[PDB]
Design a protein around this ligand. Structure first.
Ligand code: HEM
Ligand code: HEM
Lengths: 361, 362
């Protein structure tokens, strides 16, 4: 029902995946370091209440009738719904407040990749809040109120709602399906593998940027799916594209979805074969992404796809090589990357006196 | 997780309890072949029967011929029905085709212009529509997708709207939801158990002049943007004055409980509840069934939010049009703008497994 906000790490990374996502990048409008630190503290105070299901500040009502409510109200009477709020700091943030020399090496800018069609308006950002919850309105309310609290000091650059499973109907003993119709998540790092998070996800002190020990690095890609094209392809084309069958999700020739894959049995350009760590010198990702359907465009097509999110200990040893190994992926015929951003995710709020980003400021 | 029954005198999705998610879709028809269209109509009903029960359309999502695309796009596999309802309606522009002109109901009136109106003609109008409501958005999407797929070449999607969470209620025994302005929305609506009020204000009758519309209803849909920036810098008193109810409990001004009957003369002359209330409109009553939406940023540093407003009524001329006309002086106007519109006739329900959608019109 509620995920502990405080911790060595921020919640929302290795904690159970919630049903809905509301992702927002902000740009910073102030040049004042003090102003900004002030805001980070206020934001942390508000996260504490939100994640515990209380209104922000003095509340949503019952105040001076001649002042606007501290909290906008639309969450009154809902449960915290496993709300987690994770903040990240984008590369452009380190050009302000004189932090240029504190940018971590691992927060590397992404190359341009074959096929990229990055929309600048839906790319980048000085910082980000990932808001995950089982109730979409709880998620929206958090983002809405944080934007409200930071107004005049930050603005929302771009926004993405996503959804995964519906927990009030689907078993946790069950893998969700992406909008292409294949199980998605079968081979991933799971929050239970302290060993794999420590090795593959968390930033380590001896990695090079001490303020980031306990943090992680986030890569975000808005990936539109060409659905009407995909739906016209034969069942065998689709299975051929991934290296797994559609119904059970098993690696070709195997019979259970969770049978270890035999990579030589898959077509050389199969998605699973190209993404697999054995084809990538061990590179392994924690994927934590959501499907989106934003509507339909001016030509009658479903504007839908996968808001892809990956956490890793180092962007250079995680996303960049795997993404690069996808240059010839058969999936490329059916997807286009149209947004992208990277963020360093600072370590957690240790206690009630800690604040977001304290290790950096 | 239950399934909602698909057959009945009336289509589901109207008086049915309001499900969490919405995916609305307006279609324009791209065939002139009446037989082409009726065959579409019979194929859609058949899919809809499978979809509302939790099954795949046609031969299923996998296991068919390898060389052939699956009948069902597959992303609902292993998911429950989720109380999915599929509701279809016919826009006024449809009767220009197939020689249907004389069958247009009088009650499917075009809406006049309203002050403040600012209607994007792209996200407006429509030959027909499918309203898909479900508690799982994947389920809702999968239905519209597979429906559009089956109709490729006979209909195309003109526009759609996703509703990420409800702001209506047809079940006054469960908690009322709040809209994006923070107030409860749905308190004094029509409930699915008030059979008397449903006949009086929602279902079309044989005597109403168009017989094939018997047992159906008429749908108005308005896309209404909210100036949340403006609203969020208004005082609590200003906000509460605009509606006439308080924000926390939702009670009429001066009363104590959300469901106490509003005493309209204590409300400001231009308070929303006072103007919308049927006693101020000669008894005009609506069935509200709308959803909240947010469609990213606005590119000006703020969230783009609003309400996708849907109302079912026995006759548009005595439902939405008079109540909306009275809202011309509504204090809420300062914070909203209407930016899409469309009306549909929703026909009777599919009586049994040999019936089909529109069978009474064709
Ligand atoms: C629309 C875009 C994508 C779709 C539909 C998709 C789908 C899938 C599917 C069905 C699987 C097999 C089941 C599983 O998740 O383990 C998979 C695995 C995987 N994908 Fe993707 N993927 C997409 C994009 C990406 C991107 C952009 C990357 C990396 C930059 C990526 C990396 C991986 C990895 C590492 C695996 C695990 C393979 C293994 O170790 O067995 N995917 N993906
Ligand atoms: C963003 C747009 C709107 C918002 C936020 C809004 C909000 C509200 C609220 C808070 C209530 C009070 C509780 C309830 O009975 O549900 C209400 C009632 C009502 N509203 Fe609206 N409304 C909007 C637009 C409209 C429109 C366009 C119409 C009709 C054209 C309308 C008609 C009504 C009616 C008939 C009632 C019931 C009055 C009664 O019998 O007490 N509203 N609305």
């Amino acid at each position: 029902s509620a995920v502990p906000f405080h911790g060595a790490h921020q919640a929302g990374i290795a904690t159970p995946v919630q049903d809905r996502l509301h992702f927002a990048a902000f740009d910073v409008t102030t040049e004042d370091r003090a102003a900004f630190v002030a805001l980070l503290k206020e934001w942390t105070a508000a996260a504490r209440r939100l994640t515990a299901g209380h209104a922000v500040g003095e509340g949503a009502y019952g105040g001076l009738p001649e002042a606007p409510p501290d909290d906008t109200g639309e969450a009154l009477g809902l449960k915290p719904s496993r709300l987690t709020l994770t903040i990240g700091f984008g590369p452009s943030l380190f050009t302000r407040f004189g932090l240029a020399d504190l940018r971590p090496e691992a927060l590397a800018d992404l190359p341009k990749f074959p096929g990229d069609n990055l929309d600048r308006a839906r790319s980048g950002g000085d910082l980000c809040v990932q808001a995950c919850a089982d109730d979409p309105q709880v998620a929206v309310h958090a983002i809405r109120n944080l934007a409200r609290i930071g107004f005049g000091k930050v603005v929302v650059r771009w926004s993405q709602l996503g959804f995964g499973k519906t927990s009030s109907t689907t078993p946790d003993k069950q893998t969700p399906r992406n909008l292409l119709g294949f199980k998605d998540g079968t081979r991933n790092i799971a929050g239970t593998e302290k060993d794999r998070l420590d090795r593959f996800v968390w930033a380590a002190e001896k990695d090079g940027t001490p303020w980031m020990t306990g943090g992680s690095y986030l890569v975000a890609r808005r990936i539109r799916m060409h659905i009407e094209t995909w739906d016209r392809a034969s069942l065998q084309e689709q299975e051929d594209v991934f290296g797994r069958d559609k119904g059970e999700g098993a690696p070709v020739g195997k019979a259970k979805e969770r049978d270890e894959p035999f990579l030589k049995a898959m077509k050389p350009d199969a998605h699973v074969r190209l993404a697999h760590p054995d084809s990538n010198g061990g590179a392994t990702l924690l994927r934590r992404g959501y499907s989106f359907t934003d509507g339909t465009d001016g030509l009658g097509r479903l504007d839908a796809g996968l808001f892809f999110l990956a956490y890793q200990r180092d962007i250079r040893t995680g996303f960049v090589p795997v993404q690069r190994n996808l240059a010839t992926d058969a999936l490329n015929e059916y997807i286009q990357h149209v947004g992208s951003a990277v963020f360093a995710v600072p370590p957690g709020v240790r206690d009630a006196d800690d604040w977001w980003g304290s290790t950096l400021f």
